[PDB]
């Protein structure tokens, strides 16, 4: 009934960075948070940021500050991820979670995308 | 950022032989913690949240306990599909951080 | 019309009389002083206030972390106790309508909507940039805006007075405090009544000035 | 209100202050009336006039001072009626919609007693 | 229909139960509890104290002990209530000496007797307690938000003096706290929205 | 700005000084009194004044026949003598132009155009609703408006003063009069200069207040 979908890979060269789609179904999208998790092939889990659905309020990491940009749409009940100036260093599998009032949990996850960049 | 120390980073065990993984935090996060199972195919699934509380649909073999300075994840009986990457996370305060992790191995010749 | 001259600078302001003293007291000295070094009003960046503006908040001394001469003494010394004189002047014509509530919230604990996760360091201390109200009706701390008038406040109405002057003494449990850690006061501008105009969208600028008057410093280092 | 919910018996005189947040050129007049306990709530206008009332103008006074004579309650009495005396006159450049903000405070004779628990858990 | 009691001293001072715990005791062939005695747990006293910013009061702790039955009869146990002030590290090697150290204040009371009543003085580095603290814990630069290390009263530690008694009775302990000499500053707006967590001010709505 | 408080109510008004006393006298007592019972200003229904508005007239006490507390004593007692304080305040912005002549006509005999038939009872006494000038140039009595200034009057100009205050003492041949029969005074607002505006049609409201100050009553019955 409830799941998350983020299919595709979308490999890209530097000079521009691809923007994620995260779509949710099975629950009211306006009443729940949206999170993001980055899985690096070097077994890094490093967390990206969280965005509120109602407001545009976001939270970003120190090392990821100024890079990641979060935006959501309540009309399509989806979530978007906007990066800038990706280089050959950044590669990973992107995830998007939900949360909620209690526990703000990770319980539901996506399939994941394969991002491989090269010069 | 508040760092989550997960040890040991690796272990080798056979079917059975219950083993608990202990995480330590430099600050007090309260009763708020989450455990995540990471499958080799790339799909992450939650297991244990808020200490004694567990997920509906996950078998009872997964359990947890707290000595009050530490957070422990106890598995009663292991299996062949129980080899994954376990991580302890603190959702009590931003930013959310991830632990070191442990890769379960099987004793062979 | 009346210019308020403090230090080597000054700003043209409305006639200042019977200014609001927070909790009926003024920032006296603790029973060197920066009446020269760091004195003059520090004008922050003018925010664009539109019809859909929820509000803005500047913690003290969060917006002052690095500002002019005062930005040096923040990380320079060990402790301080400082008063604040806040003058918020909003310039507009007689054809604009609206209301702005300038209130000082002592010891403001922020919060988040529909989650138990506590905000991080970058979310609390934003520096000079300042934040924006997520839900100004609940003040973001969980309380109600209707009873929020218990604090010191002044009313800016485009009819009567377009400016406001609030004086904040030193409010703390300790005689001195840490510059980069604890925020004693909070400055918040709450647009209870939104903007309205003949045109679909307009822009009303807001000027904010803060004077760290009658303060001290201890623990000289660096 | 929030402090009185910790008590039961409350007796004292209240006060109401109204502020007009519209533009400077807004014309027109209003009417401000109070209803005594069991006071035959006004159908249109003149019924409200039989009690204490004041005519308030947008142009002259920007604020309202209203002293209400010592209500009472413990564990339909009062009311406040407001109508349109004349039409709202605004220029072409100003917006058509204005608003108001009501205020309430307590006088020096407001008294409280008999502490109890707040009915609102959250 | 139709100022003495309105004072802050009479308003904030009331007897309320801030801790409720009952440990299961049948056969052990341990039994103890410690808690930080904070006002953020009990929901009615929390919002009662959320009205004000800084508070100065002397906590008055009273321990009420009741024994239930899971006809034998109720024996008279001897209980020890020890207060551990902030700064005392707790390396618990139970069955040996920390409890009995003469530094911490302890009190002995039986089951049938007037309830043990002690008055904790005002222990702080600053002038008054901080209910609303804007900042972070200590200087860690990312240190915990919403918790001030400057204000911690301590932990209330209570155990039974006697050894294991062969009964299946459960001991119920109730701790009431009525503050005295209350001084108030900077009243704030009430919080109508429910409490999601006691660690911070987050609201649901 | 100055509020005029009479009785248990009041109305925000312009500064009142050097008010017009009709024929240079004030309504003194005849050589119980309603300084409490029927005192406060009774505000009539606001009339919509447009470009093609000829005018309006309220006879005294025709508009007061049944009004508030005063409506009871009209049919209650046998005779009375009453003064009147009339304050007509017309609120408008600075972009409106026009002129309003507020004049009190003592002993006003109305008339009809091009007929010898005398008006009936419903045409003379209209109650609170009030009438409308058929031909305001001739005043409807046959006289001329140019020389109509001989009566007590004040000028309401949207430039100088937007309000007017006229005090009418008791004018009668008899010391007392009949409530439902004879009308001593008449209140008339004459728009000598019509309205003009950028838009084709606008609406300017007019507020009228009348205070029966310093009166008496006799012949108690019912």
Coordinates of N, CA and C in Angstrom, one line a residue, chain C residues 22-23 59-60 103-109 141 148 150-153 168-172 182-188, chain E residues 50-54 131-134 185-189:
Chain C
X22 N 12.6 47.6 28.9 CA 12.2 46.2 29.2 C 12.1 45.9 30.6
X23 N 10.9 45.5 31.1 CA 10.6 45.1 32.4 C 10.9 46.3 33.4
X59 N 18.6 36.6 16.9 CA 18.9 36.4 18.3 C 20.1 37.3 18.7
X60 N 20.2 37.6 20.0 CA 21.2 38.5 20.5 C 22.3 37.7 21.3
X103 N 8.7 42.4 19.0 CA 8.7 41.9 20.4 C 10.1 41.3 20.6
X104 N 10.6 41.4 21.9 CA 11.8 40.8 22.3 C 11.5 39.6 23.2
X105 N 11.9 38.4 22.8 CA 11.6 37.2 23.5 C 12.8 36.8 24.3
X106 N 12.9 37.0 25.7 CA 14.0 36.6 26.4 C 14.0 35.0 26.5
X107 N 15.2 34.4 26.4 CA 15.4 33.0 26.5 C 14.4 32.2 25.6
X108 N 14.7 32.3 24.3 CA 13.8 31.8 23.3 C 14.3 30.4 22.9
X109 N 13.6 29.3 23.2 CA 13.9 28.0 22.8 C 13.0 27.7 21.5
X141 N 7.9 28.0 19.1 CA 8.3 27.4 20.4 C 7.1 26.6 21.0
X148 N 1.4 36.3 23.5 CA 2.8 36.7 23.3 C 3.1 38.1 23.7
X150 N 3.0 39.4 26.5 CA 3.5 39.6 27.9 C 4.9 40.1 27.9
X151 N 5.7 40.0 26.8 CA 7.0 40.4 26.8 C 7.1 42.0 26.5
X152 N 8.2 42.6 26.5 CA 8.3 44.0 26.0 C 8.1 44.0 24.5
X153 N 7.3 45.0 24.1 CA 6.9 45.1 22.7 C 6.5 46.5 22.4
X168 N 16.8 46.8 25.7 CA 16.9 45.6 26.4 C 18.1 45.6 27.4
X169 N 17.9 45.5 28.7 CA 19.0 45.4 29.6 C 19.6 44.0 29.6
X170 N 20.6 43.7 30.5 CA 21.2 42.4 30.5 C 20.3 41.4 31.3
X171 N 19.8 40.4 30.7 CA 18.9 39.4 31.3 C 19.7 38.1 31.3
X172 N 20.1 37.6 32.4 CA 20.8 36.3 32.6 C 20.8 35.9 34.0
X182 N 25.5 30.9 24.4 CA 24.1 31.2 24.9 C 23.7 32.6 24.3
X183 N 22.4 32.6 23.9 CA 21.7 33.8 23.4 C 20.7 34.3 24.4
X184 N 21.0 35.5 25.0 CA 20.1 35.9 26.1 C 18.8 36.4 25.6
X185 N 18.8 37.3 24.7 CA 17.5 37.9 24.1 C 17.3 37.3 22.7
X186 N 16.1 37.7 22.2 CA 15.8 37.4 20.8 C 15.0 38.5 20.2
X187 N 15.3 39.0 19.0 CA 14.6 40.1 18.4 C 13.7 39.5 17.2
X188 N 12.4 39.7 17.3 CA 11.5 39.2 16.4 C 10.5 40.3 15.9
Chain E
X50 N 6.3 26.3 32.9 CA 6.7 26.8 31.6 C 6.3 28.3 31.5
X51 N 5.5 28.8 32.4 CA 5.0 30.1 32.4 C 6.1 31.1 32.7
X52 N 7.1 30.7 33.4 CA 8.1 31.6 33.9 C 9.5 31.1 33.3
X53 N 10.4 32.1 33.2 CA 11.7 31.8 32.6 C 12.7 31.3 33.7
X54 N 13.1 32.2 34.6 CA 14.0 31.8 35.7 C 13.2 31.6 37.0
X131 N 14.7 27.6 33.1 CA 13.8 26.7 32.5 C 13.9 26.8 30.9
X132 N 14.1 28.0 30.4 CA 14.4 28.2 29.0 C 15.8 28.6 28.8
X133 N 16.6 27.8 28.2 CA 18.0 28.0 27.9 C 18.2 28.0 26.4
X134 N 18.6 29.1 25.9 CA 18.9 29.3 24.5 C 20.4 29.1 24.3
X185 N 10.6 35.4 37.7 CA 11.1 36.4 36.8 C 10.7 36.1 35.3
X186 N 10.4 37.1 34.5 CA 10.2 37.0 33.1 C 9.1 36.0 32.8
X187 N 7.8 36.3 33.0 CA 6.7 35.4 32.7 C 6.6 35.3 31.1
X188 N 6.2 34.1 30.7 CA 6.2 33.8 29.3 C 4.8 33.4 28.9
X189 N 4.5 33.2 27.6 CA 3.2 32.7 27.2 C 3.0 31.3 27.5

